[PDB]
Curated annotation (Swiss-Prot), chain A:
Name of the protein in its database record: HAUS augmin-like complex subunit 8
Portion of the full sequence shown: 159 to 210 of 367
Subunit structure, interactors included: Component of the HAUS augmin-like complex. The complex interacts with the gamma-tubulin ring complex and this interaction is required for spindle assembly. Associates with microtubules. The interaction with microtubules is strong during mitosis, while it is weak or absent during interphase. It is unclear whether this interaction is direct or indirect.
Coiled-coil spans in chain: 25-52
Subcellular compartments: Cytoplasm; Cytoplasm, Cytoskeleton, Microtubule organizing center, Centrosome; Cytoplasm, Cytoskeleton, Spindle; Cytoplasm, Cytoskeleton, Spindle pole
Residue ranges crossing the lipid bilayer per the database entry: none
Family listed: Belongs to the HAUS8 family.
Native source species: Xenopus laevis
Function text: Contributes to mitotic spindle assembly, maintenance of centrosome integrity and completion of cytokinesis as part of the HAUS augmin-like complex.
Length: 52, 232, 53, 196
């Protein structure tokens, strides 16, 4: 039983680490994808202010 | 700047220590985030005996072991706490200076949060189950948790979503945005050249000057602010 | 082919279609996700730029 | 239709699940050395390639049985002649545990590498094993809950900007046509401050 629960611990912690490394990679480019669209927001909103 | 997030997270961990009824806060009524941050982040016995209470909440057999160790054996308490936190997958067994309080505050905060998480909240206060014989409780609780874990792992792993959670990707972006999102080597230069904690400050600074100038011009132009609508 | 509607709502995560399932199967309970909440605000420098704009 | 998998696949001698699952575990362990060591025997369709594949699996797993030593089920080439029953299962369990540890030693952070040595520590107390195990289960749930928050909030913040930049892309075009009405009228700018 002690080797059985420590086989469940290894399954859980392996999955957590597999998620962390792939999820941080999604979050890293998700912020850059939002920043690349706020660049487009800022200049367009400012151009519209001059044209107003 | 920076340490304002470490001050705020010290209050999170301190209110959670009160909710979880830490006896090492009995009468210790701090209301200053700096004093709260120093209680959780400075090298003190007060903090080390809090870490011992957190260790005793998670793993009660350490409480006999750490109460066998005196004031003059505190650097032995530090090593058995670090050795427990290594067995618990929280730090290295030589991470003694996280246990003392000489590590960077965000590391101490992240470590204390990973202790307070495992100390499940008292939501259904089952008054009698506090001290009935642990030697005829522990094996039941291990078998019930092994069963919960077999059921939970067998029913997580029955989901078709169970490789997507482990390899996540997302795209909200439609075709009319993809020319921008492909322009990486031109536009990411701007996104790295912004000075951020400066840019935010100078933006509020100019907004205050222009607001003051616009206020003063309206406190001069009072006759011109009179609603004489019949101009024509 | 079919096409996606550009006005489709937020699509559920691979996590929700695993959590909802484990709650409906009783192998989790809400009280064990509540005692596992994690308020780390996402994309906070994309907000830092938006607030300047 | 010809190769049974799942839990019970090794309750009987099963060469084709043995070929697949061992090439897989070597291929997730070391994808380059798998593509070399099995290069001449993969797939093991014949009676020579069956012997070469079983040799190569036994010699890599004996290295793991010498490298992990007392933590590993002693590798003997007879096990692969008729691959099945609980002595084949037990070797495959410790092989899978070794490949998962060889991912924790690769896919944890530079500060978190010690979690491999912790999961190499076979705790013998059922209380500290239960405490370690709850902590592992709750760390899994906390990352699974933030997977929703990242996937959902990326959609929330993007769909807002996908509207705002489409709205402004039309208001710009209204203004850029109103402008081209005034461009016809004003040719009396230099007159203004004199005539004031």
């Amino acid at each position: 039983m002690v080797e059985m629960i420590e086989s469940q611990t290894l399954l859980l912690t392996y999955l957590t680490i597999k998620m962390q490394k792939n999820l941080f990679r999604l979050e890293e480019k998700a912020e850059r994808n939002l920043l690349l669209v706020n660049d487009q927001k800022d200049q367009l909103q400012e151009t519209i202010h001059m044209m107003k | 700047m920076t340490g304002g997030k470490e001050l705020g997270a010290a209050v999170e961990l301190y209110e959670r220590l009160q909710m979880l009824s830490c006896p090492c806060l009995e009468g210790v009524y701090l209301t200053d985030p700096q004093s709260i941050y120093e209680l959780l982040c400075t090298p003190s016995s007060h903090r080390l005996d809090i870490l011992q209470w957190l260790c005793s909440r998670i793993y009660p057999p350490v409480q006999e072991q750490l109460s066998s160790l005196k004031e003059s054996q505190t650097d032995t308490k530090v090593k058995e706490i670090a050795k427990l936190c290594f067995d618990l997958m929280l730090c290295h067994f030589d991470d003694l200076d996280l246990i003392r309080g000489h590590a960077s505050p965000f590391k101490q905060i992240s470590f204390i949060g990973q202790l307070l998480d495992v100390i499940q909240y008292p939501d259904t206060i089952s008054s009698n189950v506090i001290l009935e014989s642990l030697s005829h409780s522990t094996e039941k609780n291990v078998v019930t948790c092994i069963r919960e874990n077999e059921e939970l792992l067998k029913e997580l792993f029955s989901s078709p979503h169970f490789q997507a959670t482990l390899s996540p990707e997302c795209n909200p972006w439609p075709a009319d945005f993809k020319p921008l999102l492909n322009a990486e080597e031109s536009l990411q230069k701007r996104a790295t050249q912004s000075s951020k904690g400066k840019d935010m400050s100078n933006s509020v600074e100019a907004l205050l000057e222009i607001s003051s100038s616009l206020k003063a011009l309206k406190e001069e132009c009072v006759d011109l602010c009179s609603s004489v609508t019949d101009g024509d | 082919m079919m096409a996606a509607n550009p006005w489709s709502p937020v699509q559920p995560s691979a996590a929700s279609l695993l959590l909802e399932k484990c709650l409906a199967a009783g192998v989790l309970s809400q009280n064990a996700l509540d005692q596992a909440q994690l308020e780390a605000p996402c994309f906070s420098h994309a907000e830092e730029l938006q607030r300047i704009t | 239709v010809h190769v049974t998998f799942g839990v019970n696949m090794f309750d009987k001698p099963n060469k084709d699940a043995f070929y697949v699952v061992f090439h897989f575990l070597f291929g997730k362990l070391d994808n380059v050395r798998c593509k070399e060591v099995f290069r001449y025997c993969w797939p093991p369709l014949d009676k020579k390639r069956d012997a070469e594949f079983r040799k190569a699996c036994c010699e890599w797993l004996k290295k793991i049985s010498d490298e992990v030593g007392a933590g590993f089920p002693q590798v003997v080439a007879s096990i692969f002649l008729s691959p099945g029953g609980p002595k084949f299962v037990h070797l495959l369990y410790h092989f899978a545990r070794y490949v998962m540890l060889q991912h924790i030693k690769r896919d944890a952070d530079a500060g978190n590498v010690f979690i491999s040595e912790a999961l190499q520590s076979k705790i013998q107390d059922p209380q500290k094993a239960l405490a370690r195990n709850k902590l592992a289960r709750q760390k899994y749930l906390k990352v699974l809950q933030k997977e929703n928050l990242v996937i959902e909030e990326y959609q929330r913040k993007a769909q807002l900007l996908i509207k705002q930049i489409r709205d402004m892309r039309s208001e710009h075009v209204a203004l850029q046509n109103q402008q081209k009405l005034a461009e016809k009228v004003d040719r009396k700018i230099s007159d203004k401050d004199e005539n004031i």
